[PDB]
Amino acid sequence: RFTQALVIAYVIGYVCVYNKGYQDTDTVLSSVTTKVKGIALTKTSELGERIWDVADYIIPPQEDGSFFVLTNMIITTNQTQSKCAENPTPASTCTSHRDCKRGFNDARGDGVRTGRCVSYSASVKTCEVLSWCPLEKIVDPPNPPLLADAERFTVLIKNNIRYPKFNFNKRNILPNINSSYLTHCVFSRKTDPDCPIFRLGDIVGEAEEDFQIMAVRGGVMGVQIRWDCDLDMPQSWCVPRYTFRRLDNKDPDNNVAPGYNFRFAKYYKNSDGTETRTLIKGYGIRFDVMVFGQAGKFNIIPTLLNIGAGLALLGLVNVICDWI
């Protein structure tokens, strides 16, 4: 009896109301584009005093569902194909030319050996290599990071979605939004919740992380957009909701392999018309954009079927009381 009304009454509240078994259900089809805005100033030793704008700090300019913002750098300029001593190291140090085999090439080395053992300094000798010389100096990335200004950068995240079963289209620029608003707004939980232009600092902060710390060696940030919509309700709900998680750093006890960095270059031709290269070991945050969602709507079919299933238990409650 209590078991009866408990079950019969349960299949309603539990499955039909709470779990909305009366609803037909779709998953979201999503597309996103992003644009980052902001300007960093750096004075280093020595490229001098320099600005970095969007075309400088987003590598590459375009990716589908993510963007990478440069935070820190180690820059080696005026490289050319030439010979130079490798950086001092147990595998690179030498005394005799015989230590360095010509043509010797190992994945972790600075180039292809000549092989001569040559002075890296007055204190130390190293195997000569054919490489892009000068080699990158061995040093820790600058703290504070050169691109600290990037905490204040903003990103417009534009997101189109559709729910095919329901022929329902929407965009995360809401209908109450307009051009002006985007001329000024920056997303805020309190004053600007419908602004899809987020401050990078706020993104990482809301994930309980410190941009300036994280900017030194770089990292990976998730931006999640959940579109969960009961289409029985007005189309005015069915708004995106935003969470921010840090993706990397899943074993913080390690000092092993922190952050995110990669190398890239800018090539030039010089007077003689021979190539020279600027190599950057860049550190930054990859912002990864992830869209999920499920739309429900009322349908009789799932209702019925779920009731057919529902009573199956309703009868064999008391039937099973005897069935033992």
Place this chain on the structure above:
Amino acid sequence: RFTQALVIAYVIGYVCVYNKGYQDTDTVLSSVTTKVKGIALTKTSELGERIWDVADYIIPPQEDGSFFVLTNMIITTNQTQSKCAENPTPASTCTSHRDCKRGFNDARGDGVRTGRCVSYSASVKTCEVLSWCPLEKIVDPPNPPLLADAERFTVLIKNNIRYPKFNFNKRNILPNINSSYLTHCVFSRKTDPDCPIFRLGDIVGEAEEDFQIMAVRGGVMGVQIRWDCDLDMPQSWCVPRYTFRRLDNKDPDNNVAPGYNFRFAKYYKNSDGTETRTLIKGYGIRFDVMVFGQAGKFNIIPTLLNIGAGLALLGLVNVICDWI
């Protein structure tokens, strides 16, 4: 009785025949590469008369499951790190130097302020900034778009797929295809259905969109390849099928944030050996390639099980007639 043969007869037609419950079922593993071919000519004011080929208009050259084709541009050439007046704007206009705080930097501004209030023109003064100068002029993207020729571009979409349960491998270059055919063919529903080289114009047109309109501010195009295969049938069916949808523009009543654009640059060293930069605000279409599919095959197990389930209803039709 009618309910009997209706159910007993139903679990067969409905689930076993229509819904193929007698089949073991896999989902597709997919991989795609793409190559775009074509050449655009532009005469602008003034880079002059210029061609754009694949290495000019695909940014970047390589992405996994998508490609971006440049359609329109705003190009600012001969930039260097220097000082210049910001573009006229409620936030940038000034009268007194005191209006412009040195070091002032806001995400939406043209650079880092000096701050001096200087002439932007004879009519107007603006805060000076350290930036890449000259700044980009404020203007609408060219209509017609500079890259209109891109409607006639073609893209080879090569797609490998496998169904691991069934050890079934296939490629969207069909076995009846050959090298010559690819030397000439362009996909057509009527004459060239097995040509996997699609004209961009036809892609967007088939999605009921107008390439030249869409090329002005850019946009996002879905290309869907469904591989749905009943492996009971000959391996000669199990061909890919193509649909084309536009992904963005999901709230067309808005004038807010149309299309797709991003900024990127080309760096050079000049006489003095100081950097100069060409900044492009590029507009284009992102073509996004999406592969789905499910392979069925005959298996007795799903048959049996689905019958065990099937009769469960068959008996309690008439049993439930009494059960009330």
Place this chain on the structure above:
Amino acid sequence: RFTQALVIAYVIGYVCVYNKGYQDTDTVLSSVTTKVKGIALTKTSELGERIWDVADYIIPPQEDGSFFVLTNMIITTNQTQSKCAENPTPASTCTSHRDCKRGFNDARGDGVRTGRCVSYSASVKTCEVLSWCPLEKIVDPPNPPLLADAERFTVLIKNNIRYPKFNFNKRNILPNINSSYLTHCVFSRKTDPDCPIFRLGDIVGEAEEDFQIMAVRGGVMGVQIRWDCDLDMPQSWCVPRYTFRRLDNKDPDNNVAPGYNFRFAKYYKNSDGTETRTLIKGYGIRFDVMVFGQAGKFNIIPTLLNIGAGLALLGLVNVICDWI
């Protein structure tokens, strides 16, 4: 009876033990970054003797969940916007200027026609085009491939994962790993199984492919990381496991459209300050990184429910013996 203990005993072994129906179950959230290390030497005709390092051979430097390594190249240098004869071809050959319509532009041609019919050689005439000239010569990619050294390249694959239900975080740099180890280790099934730095050669070899063959025209390699974890066991299991599959080449009987290649360029300004371009048709392997996994953990609920379901068959074994 045998059917009884067979079923009753079955729902335990089969579903609860083998299929672990007593477990709550999550799917993995994953993130990966990669870094490739190594240096190739090339002597070609004629860019001369040249090294290629990470900034030379990874195009682009950064992608989410994949990386592309250059293996072979065809390089055309000193291109500028100018006129030249198209490469000899049934569609490009001519006798009369009248064969070449000015402005004529077809997706598969070398440029925009002048149109004049001009000498491509002493033997042959071809339509003149406005293009980036000189055009790329028509030739087979070098065998052996210029970048054969890339077989010996290494890639650090760093992978963070979480299982939200279980609040479980881990990284594929295991807790028994340290900095030194990464200073030296390369992944080996036998001696270095916890080294997440893989030799490209070993990746393709383990997929039963030949790097040097595959390097000529390029290809696509899958790297799969399965994290399947029974969290009832110690967190010390729940290690990633690695498989390596080749993704493309799913119809090897074809000579049609082998491998992976794309075109890209490097732009320069010359003396006069007019653009010149190096065009590379690059061939290489796309390494695609794929992370899957399911974590189980003990929960009473799934246990109970699965028993409720389990006995449903247990009773109607002997009940159904009569039910016919």
